[PDB]
């Protein structure tokens, strides 16, 4: 018939095809109750500040401020020099720098080798 | 406006501070998923599902309709990754493995025997462009001082 | 299964409140109360004969429109453009360079007057 | 495009519902509740709204679809969505 | 809060034959396969057993994902349409109005006078509606995002300004 | 003598409306009409250089103002009057003037109509100095001004985030192309020691490997060829006049316009032509393949544009530069009609743009019906029409040449598909039953439309002859060939009409349609936008945070040098200051210092 739609990181599995979505059960039944209950309170006080006549300001989002700290300042306070970070740091650090060193130096000596006896043509190459 | 205790700190060790972190991120205890503390400084920041903003229901009233994102609820560590403008991971009608196989199989068909195409060129039973004045040696930039090798062609 | 009465009784409350909202979003006949502006005499004698509206009245209105647009958009450019090339750009050599017209066997030159000899007898190819 | 008044939109919904074969062209009413008064079921509402979404061009949301089951309250939602005022 | 067993099939039907319309194109072709879609939908109406009914959901969705149009049809005004949030370029919020210069609000005096009266209604009804809200909130905030209506006369339904003064869908 | 002044004015007089716009004197209303008259008068001014050209054939260089005396390099404002320049100008002004008439019809409710017309003119300037550019820097001036204005123009309604997404995508693919443009500039300035085009031709780079592929990559950017194709179909997201003018007839063809302007240098290297045949071939097959099963009214024709672009740059591929320029004029004529016609029926059909809800408009809108049929017939190559004189002449040329083997079969097969989607667009949109919403508001009786379509209509009918005969012969005429492939330019479109008609009729046959795997392939634009816009963009930009920002700058680079030395002082400065204070410990230390000084290290010894 038709095998399946296999999900991936960029091709996620839809809720319609989700098996656990169709596997409703009492213990997860009350678990989805507070999902909206938490949402309901977050929509209540937001709207209260949203439509306050004297509200002349910006309604600060604590989640937004938390996201800014987590992605800007908190990385080092909770950083740990574990071995994995060292390979990742070395591979993405001095790795490409030395890789481009091999590429650039090889051409530079190859180009210098060629010109020093005059194989490369500079009949009109003056604007160096 | 905001106090220190509701800010991202260290990755939780104990379940008690795991629950406290969840309330700090105004989410319940059982869905709180701190990032793996492998070696990075993610701290106690929760791991929201890696799903784009597009997958969120458009019909649902969103506080930020541009981002389809509400107020106060935890936001993804990669909100910019999964914004509507940026990378979208919405489901596709056909599977991701078949997604690339047909595309890769397509371009492979092109390049592999375009080589076969170029080694067996298509043409007509034609000869060379018989040209006068020594194949236009002079007027094709040839040196007028040096006498060219005579290229001539008689009738048939 | 449908609305639970309460939400409906509320929606119509929002409906009538929305009823009055954009029942206040229109404009009275006087608004916008256009503030006065100084007026040129040019439109004064354009409308002094425009009210008739017969064919030739608006035709000459468009005829001047075309010419008045032309002078300020096709005359004053070529005035300064021709000034720019013929007396500044062409005054500097190698700035404006021209293809010499392709002379064909049998043509005559205005200055020299010598005719380029006609090419010799054709092989007489006829279909 | 000229706007549609409350009379016009109620007249437009009047035509499409009257055309429906399941209902009877003399019992139709603006306040007649679908599943009880006209004797419909829940799996008749769905085909009603798409037949309503068709001639109007826009889509009422699914979350507001199951409760969209009264001809007077039919036009109330559409008039709200297009803010067309006579 | 819940997409119970009732709506799931109702939404499933909606996306099913809308895809069919995207497939059949022609009205006569669409109608035949629409009624078959309808007839095949209720041929198992009497399915009291919920486990089989949830099972009948499984063969409804997985081939829908196979059978959905690879180029699904969407009307312009709905999610994915060619005209979704097209006019946000013109929708400017109502609060920008009071910033208008004296010349700018003298430009349209009647509207501003009426707008001031509209601002009055919000001012001396806000404290009434928030108080009305508080006395009717359940403990620990609200358990549902739905807003309560106007309990008594005079007071507007709670939290009404932005949903009423929302910019028109066709502002220009 | 007149040639220098008239063509220059066609550029200068095109910019006054921009300066008047900045003066704000325009009281709206009259401004769009004022813009149209300037463009129309620019067109009429642009004629008398063209009629001059066929009389004699003089082509000049109008280097006027010196900009840089950069040592041996002599950057100056230089415009090259040549056949490609002086002839494309009236064609470009003709299409943009007629659609300027069309823009008022469609966008009448837009509060920023004046800004829109100003944007249309500003693009026209940036394109104008591109087509007539003698030095490479002016080419980049046009090359980048046109791309920036697309971002402003198809991102007109900022509004929906998809419009900005198309704006970011369009500029990014254009950004990839000009990387080769910068590569060519570096090579030309270093090796050829110049940037004006004519000097590079003189210096005779008979082995220009690197500059030519960079130029080919630059053409691949603006022309939306493979690798960089999907920005064209996504560029429809803006207003239809933007999509009808910018990337249907003018902007996308500017990429092809680069290679032809470099033709005297291109043909020297045989190798550089093999990918031009390769690129143009597969692009025609792929873009036509998507257009077959697409549904958006603009998607079908937008893919047809890219398929046309692949066809015309195949010609310059096989030593046919001028024939590519021949196609540049015909394609700009009728393709604008097809987009403008679709824009007309969109407006009438309550801004609906999916063929599933069109149909039955053959009789409701006859004027647009006639325009599209004969517009599509030119697009398919109806003999003795505008399309045939270029497209079928091209097919007669490419098939008979030393070229890559299969590379002649896209232009054969794609032409069959080129006719195929033309039948589909005619069958679904205009023929068939009226599947549109019940409330009919359709109307096309506005004279602004009728004149706008009619202006190119006599063009799309009678231009083909009036460019074919007057221009001097500049290509070798194909005289003797077999009968079968000489007619195959016309035969191939016949089964393109036939097989597609039967396949379109299959929708009339009353039977369910199974979703084919190949049909799924064509509906997703051949899977390229799904993958290339998901995988490469996610991986690289995820590296921008996990590896680039967090790992190195915020963690590694800031913990290696600064914080380590900060901690080195921190680690043991404690007991430097932390001393017990006992006189015993202090004076015992003074003992050791004495012994180490005079006994152990023995500074005396
Ligand atoms: C350059 C852009 C010129 C056009 C322009 O102003 O566009 C504005 C336009 C934005 O207009 P907008 O979106 O309507 O602005 C709305 C705002 O509300 C603001 O405008 P507004 O809504 O109040 O009024 C509408 C309109 C009307 O204009 C204005 O209201 C602003 C007027 C600006 C000038 C103010 C001073 C005027 C008096 C002093 C100068 C007098 C002249 C003599 C000296 O506004 C504009 O046009 C915005 C102009 C903003 C300044 C642009 C730069 C000015 C020069 C510096 O800018 C663009 O679209 C960006 C284009 C960028 C360039 C792309 C192509 C570059 C190609 C290379 C350069 C050329 C090389 C040489 C080629 C030829 C070789 C031979
Ligand atoms: C052979 C050469 C092949 C070269 C392919 C280059 C293009 C592919 C990579 C960049 C893709 C950019 C793009 O268009 O992204 C589209 C994406 C989603 O938009 P869209 O595709 O329209 O889908 C509907 C959205 N509503 O929207 C976005 O992703 C927007 C945000 C983009 C942020 C990342 C920008 C690109 C980063 C680098 C990618 C890799 C570039 C490699 C260049 C190699 C050059 C040799
Ligand atoms: C000389 C002749 C050379 C060969 C020419 C072959 C093509 C001839 C013309 C075919 C036209 C088909 C057509 O217009 O189909 C329209 C149809 C639209 O979609 P729909 O209405 O949904 O019907 C399909 C099922 N959904 O869509 C379809 O039916 C899909 C048809 C897809 C056909 C793909 C053909 C590809 C040929 C080149 C392959 C190259 C591989 C390398
Ligand atoms: C591209 C498309 C492909 C094709 C895609 C559609 C699927 C085609 C294949 C068939 C799948 C399936 O058997 C039928 C389906 O469609 S779904 C499941 C329906 N299961 C029930 O109905 C039982 C449970 N019962 C209820 O939920 C209530 O009783 C109800 C709300 C219906 C009362 O409403 P009442 O009838 O008004």
PDB file of N, CA, C and O in Angstrom, chain B residues 130 152-156:
ATOM      1  N   UNK B 130      35.809  25.515 -44.306  1.00  0.00           N
ATOM      2  CA  UNK B 130      36.838  25.879 -45.272  1.00  0.00           C
ATOM      3  C   UNK B 130      36.878  27.392 -45.437  1.00  0.00           C
ATOM      4  O   UNK B 130      35.891  28.004 -45.860  1.00  0.00           O
ATOM      5  N   UNK B 152      45.168  25.612 -47.683  1.00  0.00           N
ATOM      6  CA  UNK B 152      44.381  25.750 -48.898  1.00  0.00           C
ATOM      7  C   UNK B 152      43.494  24.520 -49.044  1.00  0.00           C
ATOM      8  O   UNK B 152      43.763  23.458 -48.478  1.00  0.00           O
ATOM      9  N   UNK B 153      42.416  24.680 -49.810  1.00  0.00           N
ATOM     10  CA  UNK B 153      41.433  23.613 -49.985  1.00  0.00           C
ATOM     11  C   UNK B 153      40.822  23.736 -51.374  1.00  0.00           C
ATOM     12  O   UNK B 153      40.211  24.758 -51.699  1.00  0.00           O
ATOM     13  N   UNK B 154      40.990  22.693 -52.183  1.00  0.00           N
ATOM     14  CA  UNK B 154      40.482  22.647 -53.544  1.00  0.00           C
ATOM     15  C   UNK B 154      39.023  22.180 -53.551  1.00  0.00           C
ATOM     16  O   UNK B 154      38.509  21.641 -52.568  1.00  0.00           O
ATOM     17  N   UNK B 155      38.352  22.401 -54.681  1.00  0.00           N
ATOM     18  CA  UNK B 155      36.964  21.995 -54.848  1.00  0.00           C
ATOM     19  C   UNK B 155      36.846  20.471 -54.836  1.00  0.00           C
ATOM     20  O   UNK B 155      37.827  19.736 -54.693  1.00  0.00           O
ATOM     21  N   UNK B 156      35.617  19.994 -54.989  1.00  0.00           N
ATOM     22  CA  UNK B 156      35.339  18.567 -54.934  1.00  0.00           C
ATOM     23  C   UNK B 156      34.790  18.073 -56.266  1.00  0.00           C
ATOM     24  O   UNK B 156      35.517  17.486 -57.068  1.00  0.00           O
TER      25      UNK B 156
END
